Amino acid sequence: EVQLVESGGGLVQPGGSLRLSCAASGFNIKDTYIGWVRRAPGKGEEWVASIYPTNGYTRYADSVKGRFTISADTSKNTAYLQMNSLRAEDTAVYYCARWGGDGFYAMDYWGQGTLVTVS
Numbered sequence: 001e002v003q004l005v006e007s008g009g010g011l012v013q014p015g016g017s018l019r020l021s022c023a024a025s026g027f028n029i030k031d032t033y034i035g036w037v038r039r040a041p042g043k044g045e046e047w048v049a050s051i052y053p054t055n056g057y058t059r060y061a062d063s064v065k066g067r068f069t070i071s072a073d074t075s076k077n078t079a080y081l082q083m084n085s086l087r088a089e090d091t092a093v094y095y096c097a098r099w100g101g102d103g104f105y106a107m108d109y110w111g112q113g114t115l116v117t118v119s
Helices: none
Strands: 003-007 010-012 018-025 033-039 045-052 057-060 068-073 078-083 092-099 114-118
Touching: 003 092, 018 033, 018 092, 018 114, 033 068, 033 078, 045 068, 045 078, 045 092, 057 068
Parallel strands: 010 114
Antiparallel strands: 003 018, 018 078, 033 045, 033 092, 045 057, 068 078, 092 114
């Protein structure tokens, strides 16, 4: 079965950086759009960023443009989210997700997520 193996959360002060990692299990990231959503306190899900590793196409939510960068290493079958210039309002649990070519979720279950705390 497909699994998303997530890591890289942590605790930093505003202005600091983290890098999230999402390693694919049960599929190749070349076959897919992969990226992150986050769940902050009191909110629904917010899409953050996505990449199509085959050609490197990326797209970002306006809320993170210029601060976060999404990337992929196909030889590691892993995607990354570099988060620079973190703000307190970036505190959330971040989840890796797959989307199909229809822009809609393409995995059966959420992974366990990774916590990013900015304070």
